[PDB]
Amino acid sequence: LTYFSARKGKRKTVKAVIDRFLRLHCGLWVRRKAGYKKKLWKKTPARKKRLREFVFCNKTQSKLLDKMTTSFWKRRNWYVDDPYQKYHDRTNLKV
Amino acid sequence: ANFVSWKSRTKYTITPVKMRKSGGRDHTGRIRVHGIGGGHKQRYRMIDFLRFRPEETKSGPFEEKVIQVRYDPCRSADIALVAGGSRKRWIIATENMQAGDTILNSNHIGRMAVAAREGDAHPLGALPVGTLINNVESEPGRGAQYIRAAGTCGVLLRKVNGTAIIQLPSKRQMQVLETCVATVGRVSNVDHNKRVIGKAGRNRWLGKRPNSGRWHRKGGWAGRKIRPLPPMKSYVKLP
Amino acid sequence: LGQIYANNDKLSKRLKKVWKPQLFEREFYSEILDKKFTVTVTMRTLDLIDEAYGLDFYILKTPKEDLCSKFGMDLKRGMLLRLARQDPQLHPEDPERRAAIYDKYKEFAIPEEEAEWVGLTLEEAIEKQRLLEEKDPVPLFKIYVAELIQQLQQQALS
Amino acid sequence: KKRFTPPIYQPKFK
RNA sequence: CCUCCGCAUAAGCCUGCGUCAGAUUAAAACACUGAACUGACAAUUAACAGCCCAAUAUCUACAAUCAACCAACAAGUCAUUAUUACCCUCACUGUCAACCCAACACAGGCAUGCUCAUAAGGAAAGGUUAAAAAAAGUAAAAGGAACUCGGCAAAUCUUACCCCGCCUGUUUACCAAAAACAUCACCUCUAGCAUCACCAGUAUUAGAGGCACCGCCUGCCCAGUGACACAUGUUUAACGGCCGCGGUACCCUAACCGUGCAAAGGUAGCAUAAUCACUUGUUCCUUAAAUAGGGACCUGUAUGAAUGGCUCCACGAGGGUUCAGCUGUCUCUUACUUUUAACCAGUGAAAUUGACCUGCCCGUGAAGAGGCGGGCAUAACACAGCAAGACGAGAAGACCCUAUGGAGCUUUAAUUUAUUAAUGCAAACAGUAUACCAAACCUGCAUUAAAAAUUUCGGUUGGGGCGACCUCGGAGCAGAACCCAACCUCCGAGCAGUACAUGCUAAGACUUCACCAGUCAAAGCGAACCUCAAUUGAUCCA
RNA sequence: GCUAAACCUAGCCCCAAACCCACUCCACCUUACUACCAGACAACCUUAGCCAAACCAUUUACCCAAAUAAAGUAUAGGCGAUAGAAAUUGAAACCUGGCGCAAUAGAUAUAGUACCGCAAGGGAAAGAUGAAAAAUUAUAACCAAGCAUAAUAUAGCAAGGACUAACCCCUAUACCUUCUGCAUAAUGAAUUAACUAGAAAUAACUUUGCAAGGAGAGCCAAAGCUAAGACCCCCGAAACCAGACGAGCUACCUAAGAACAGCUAAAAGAGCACACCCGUCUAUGUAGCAAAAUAGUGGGAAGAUUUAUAGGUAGAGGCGACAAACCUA
Ligand SMILES: [Mg+2]
Ligand SMILES: [Mg+2]
Ligand SMILES: [Mg+2]
Ligand SMILES: [Mg+2]
Ligand SMILES: [Mg+2]
Ligand SMILES: [Mg+2]
Ligand SMILES: [Mg+2]
Ligand SMILES: [Mg+2]
Ligand SMILES: [Mg+2]
Ligand SMILES: [Mg+2]
Ligand SMILES: [Mg+2]
Ligand SMILES: [Mg+2]
Ligand SMILES: [Mg+2]
Ligand SMILES: [Mg+2]
Ligand SMILES: [Mg+2]
Ligand SMILES: [Mg+2]
Ligand SMILES: [Mg+2]
Ligand SMILES: [Mg+2]
Ligand SMILES: [Mg+2]
Ligand SMILES: [Mg+2]
Ligand SMILES: [Mg+2]
Ligand SMILES: [Mg+2]
Ligand SMILES: [Mg+2]
Ligand SMILES: [Mg+2]
Ligand SMILES: [Mg+2]
Ligand SMILES: [Mg+2]
Ligand SMILES: [Mg+2]
Ligand SMILES: [Mg+2]
Ligand SMILES: [Mg+2]
Ligand SMILES: [Mg+2]
Ligand SMILES: [Mg+2]
Ligand SMILES: [Mg+2]
Ligand SMILES: [Mg+2]
Ligand SMILES: [Mg+2]
Ligand SMILES: [Mg+2]
Ligand SMILES: [Mg+2]
Ligand SMILES: [Mg+2]
Ligand SMILES: [Mg+2]
Ligand SMILES: [Mg+2]
Ligand SMILES: [Mg+2]
Ligand SMILES: [Mg+2]
Ligand SMILES: [Mg+2]
Ligand SMILES: [Mg+2]
Ligand SMILES: [Mg+2]
Ligand SMILES: [Mg+2]
Ligand SMILES: [Mg+2]
Ligand SMILES: [Mg+2]
Ligand SMILES: [Mg+2]
Ligand SMILES: [Mg+2]
Ligand SMILES: [Mg+2]
Ligand SMILES: [Mg+2]
Ligand SMILES: [Mg+2]
Ligand SMILES: [Mg+2]
Fold first, then answer.
1. Biological process (GO) annotations (chain C)?
2. Could you tell me the CA-to-CA distances from A91 to A86, A88, B64, C19 in Å, in that order?
3. Which chains touch D (3 or more CB pairs under 8 A)?
4. Which of B62, B87, B106 is the last residue of a domain?
5. What is the 8-class DSSP label of residue A41?
6. Rounded to the nearest whole angstrom, what is the distance from the C-alpha of residue A74 to the centroid of ligand 6?
């Protein structure tokens, strides 16, 4: 994944991860379901409703994506009207 | 590669000239033609193919005297040494030319055709229609490039307002200017087809290498082809 | 000298391509040089000459980075030297025509000693400078006699 | 095929 | 005693057996002192051979072969003149050797002249003995190929037949010399022409190919592909191909018929062949005995005519059979000589080697034990033999498989035309009475073609290949939570039918052993008051 | 006690600073190292491929402005392996060193020499007294394998338990790797000396500092931030591409040469047969005389013959009477 670049000696990031996933500052990664816009004419409304969901990733997948991205994508952002602003923090979680 | 052609001498002469072989190689040293190389050594007799060429300070038609008829290793037909005025030259011997004969080289074209024995050169317009001819040119004064091989001959077919039509040994017809010189009769050394090589050694003496032993499968070209004769060749410029 | 894709799509083969200009042989006249030149030309420089209104104007206006020709730079140096010298260009008996051609190009004619080094490569410049400073050595006899006579004059005048 | 390995001469100074 | 040597020149090499000293040492395959050397000193003397020439024009048809008769073809190795310029002379270099190319003082390689056994030049035995095995010879009773795959080898001189290739010739330097390749002869295709090949040539020529002297012949076919004609054709001595069923008299086909198809349905000839198998086909000769050889038969169901067919002369280190001969090939081996050998003297390798104080039998065990179990055996130590074992040494098996490891070759594998050649359009030019013609070379684009280029050639598999399979569901195996393999046993699926709230949201759960996918569902907002088992396909991109 | 052993210093490495060199006479682009003669030709051009994408087919960092930061961000891309800016920021003139090597190390270097190759090209090894050698004296020994002093003793992985005694008694299937499993008769290893193989990030953990702030600008921060520690081997293909060097071997050719006794001569790509060319069969040899030889036996030997000299054609090629032949074993 180019741990060391030939120009700066820096770690690089896989841009497919950035194009496909969103990282909340707590450490959670959000993805879209596969096939959520393919052949909707053979799918039931419940299946399509569960396909339209934004879902969380595994612990293993989260660590893999953290390895595949650089620390720039893990900083705390303060956008103006972020629809995911309230999801960047964890509440009432115990160990 | 350092290749210099042996054809390097700017003055006509009668004495035979040493000719270097090639082996089917061009100036770069690579084989350009296959099956060529290593025969008997030969010398070159210089053949004057411009049959009508008057001497210095002389203008009109002239007569010549066949001194000898000799074998040429460089060509199929034999060559006649012929003297005239104060100069001698080699020309292509036609059939029934022997020592002691006289040959006419004429330029003036006549109102009525002339009677020509088998060794003279007249403009194709002055000749009768249907005569057997050889050593023909394309432009007037160009020099004989067409029929020159042993026993081969062509025929004058027609005469047109300023041109003449000639049939080649391959039966292709060509029109040339009326003032184009040609010699009457068939070329000598007939019965050249009936020569039997007898053995591969004689081919080697002739200077041709054996064919490759690789087996080539035949393509679509190999079958017999029946084509019509190609169109007329024309050497007459027209604005 | 570049490369292309087979059908202008990047997922096909890459082939090395060469694009060559269409060259033409044409004849030109120089009013400053009063000579007719045959040059291998192209449509672009024909258009440039048309825009500049004459071969002389085109050559004198275009810079070296645009003429792209040692022949053009030599022509430029020839015209510049002609203008700087104001020499008998056309011929005798036509002084007013010579002057008129000269005044057609007043916005030119850099000084004479500067117009020589126009359009000269480094090798030509070094060779010109080397032949400039040839100056075969002077015998020491002259130097010593001059020094001795100056010493004698100095000693005598005191 | 005809697999042959040429011999190797050691340096003459030894 | 040997001499198949030698002496010169060329080429190569470069002081490399001339003298003196050191020889205490050092290379001498040992030594004396000199070919496997150290230092110093000394020599190869030009007439031999190298090293040449003043221009400008011009001349140079008649081979050589005792060159004389004769006779040819493959047609050849040697010559001047005219005018101007020109009166100095013997420099320079090679000259040695026992010698060069082969890592060597190497049984190899090496041009020419001269005598072809010498007038040159050389020494097979360090000494001894007289074993085996081995090498090279000589002689051999009686027999005479009984040997053997085979008359290999040896000894004697040798008859006849067959297959293949006409012949002489060429080829895998280093395992194949042939039947293979070429080859005179025959035939097909292409080309109307000048300066760098072809060619200083011109259709009786040149080039690209097939086949293979000669003799008799080479049958039918253009449906398909290719090539040439653009008139829907021509072309097989181009790539190639030359039928099927049923009825057919006691045996067999069968002339004949009905039919279908095709371009034609294999003609002549030859024939169990160098010709799939059956096959040691059948039959006669040959032998005592014949899967061998020769001569005849054609279901040769896969013979066959320039993929050339069939005879034949001569030829062949080709492959077979044979008469006679004579031979230690053999019954059946023996004797001697030389080399080797063994001992003495001198000099002195290499592969190999975990360490070894290194036995036999039976059993065991990663399945074939010197080393383990049970027995037996057993003082130590040289020398000569032998080859049963040490799964003996050598070469990281070449056979087989595997590798998203290579490469050569062929295509009708995928991708492309950068390149060459054609076309068409554009650019460049010029007259021309509202129309037309557009020379050539460049350049850009497009198409066609030749030549190519790059890359790859899935997996499972009671080895691989071939066959079969690859996704999803139901049943058994797998009997009572779940799960559970098989190139195991059996069924199926790749849809269909009906509403169009088959709307929207949202607790809590299941889950094909991961993930991705997949499944169920309360409450709520709206609105009336879902069947089925599988029925399926991610991302990118469009 | 022989062979041996041991030794410091030639030099070298990495930095810094500074821009660095070259005619005594003679010769040297022809066959370089050549004193002295009439066609004057001439260079300027997009690398490719290995490799990665776990195949491969578009694609795959490597280019010559001090740093740092923006930032591995915008962007590019079989949107995938990977590739990747800029605006902007700001970058204190002088000081002659070494937690480098010390003869298998450090330069290949005592030297690009010897040696190998036709050529391009490849490429070594090694030395050690002392103030004085115009001190050759007696000391200085001690130490690897290999041997000698000094061969051997029934029986057995070589030892261990022992024992008064070396052996005899009893127990015991070398090591490494590879495997389901090896004493295995599976690999590797004669032996000694020297050399010879784990390189780093994200995020965590521990230990400090400061603390809603930390940090010596940039960055992070709902206890964080800063600093440190700790951490990812060695040898090996068959290949591919670019540029040079090769036809003194061999294949074919060009120029100009040479050789072929004797007999039968039919006239002759005729016959026997020398020299000469080739290599049929046998035996020997097989680390050989020889990286293809020897002896005998053979094919040809006036021709499509053999052969000396010089020259030509070269690798995406040449040449080939096609053997996938040959182009320096
Ligand atoms: Mg032919
Ligand atoms: Mg052929
Ligand atoms: Mg001498
Ligand atoms: Mg040798
Ligand atoms: Mg003598
Ligand atoms: Mg002797
Ligand atoms: Mg003896
Ligand atoms: Mg002896
Ligand atoms: Mg006997
Ligand atoms: Mg028998
Ligand atoms: Mg028997
Ligand atoms: Mg024999
Ligand atoms: Mg033959
Ligand atoms: Mg040959
Ligand atoms: Mg061979
Ligand atoms: Mg040969
Ligand atoms: Mg052989
Ligand atoms: Mg043949
Ligand atoms: Mg036929
Ligand atoms: Mg058969
Ligand atoms: Mg028999
Ligand atoms: Mg023969
Ligand atoms: Mg001895
Ligand atoms: Mg056993
Ligand atoms: Mg023994
Ligand atoms: Mg053992
Ligand atoms: Mg073995
Ligand atoms: Mg192996
Ligand atoms: Mg694989
Ligand atoms: Mg497989
Ligand atoms: Mg199987
Ligand atoms: Mg699950
Ligand atoms: Mg509800
Ligand atoms: Mg790859
Ligand atoms: Mg890999
Ligand atoms: Mg592969
Ligand atoms: Mg910047
Ligand atoms: Mg060193
Ligand atoms: Mg070194
Ligand atoms: Mg010791
Ligand atoms: Mg015991
Ligand atoms: Mg196993
Ligand atoms: Mg065991
Ligand atoms: Mg083992
Ligand atoms: Mg193994
Ligand atoms: Mg071993
Ligand atoms: Mg590869
Ligand atoms: Mg290749
Ligand atoms: Mg040569
Ligand atoms: Mg003969
Ligand atoms: Mg003979
Ligand atoms: Mg073949
Ligand atoms: Mg083959």
1. mitochondrial translation; translation
2. 10, 10, 128, 67
3. none
4. B106
5. G
6. 98
Query: Are B131 and B30 members of one domain?
Result: no
Residues 6+ away with beta carbon under 8 Å from C54: C31
Contact B133, B127 (CB under 8 A): yes
Return d(Cα B237, Cα C101) in angstroms, integer.
49
Nucleotide nearest to B31 (CA to C1'): F313
Chain B touching partners, 3 or more CB pairs below 8 A: none
Residues of the domain holding B12: 1-106
CA–CA separation, B209 vs B234, rounded Å?
38
Q: Considering only CA atoms, which of B105, B11, B110, B116 is closest in space to residue B54?
A: B105
Experimentally determined by:
cryo-EM
Which CATH number covers residue B39?
2.40.50.140
Which amino acid, B65?
K
Distance CA B203, CA B210 (A): 9
Distances (CA, A) of B46 to B9, B19, B185: 11, 11, 22
- A43: exposed, middle or buried (C-beta count within 10 Å: 0-12, 13-18, 19+)? middle
> What distance in angstroms lies between residue A71's CA and the mean position of ligand 9's atoms?
107
- Spacing of A91 CA from F7 C1' in Å: 77
- Residue A30 Cα to ligand 23 midpoint, Å, equals 94
Give, as one character, the DSSP assignment of residue C75. H
Distance from residue A44's CA to nucleotide E525's C1', rounded to whole Å? 20
B231 touches strand E (CB under 7 A): no
Please choose, from the candidates A95, A84, A27, A23, the residue with its C-alpha nearest in 3D space to the C-alpha of residue A59: A27
Task: Calculate the angstrom distance between C1' of F59 and CA of C14.
Answer: 11
Is residue B187 within 8 A of residue B134, CB to CB? The reply is yes
> Would you say the C-alpha torsion B22, B27, B33, B34 has a positive or negative sign?
positive
Q: What are phi and psi of C23, to 5 degrees?
A: -100, 145
- What is the helix (H) or strand (E) element at residue B134, kind and residue range? strand B132-134
The domain limits of chain C are 1-158
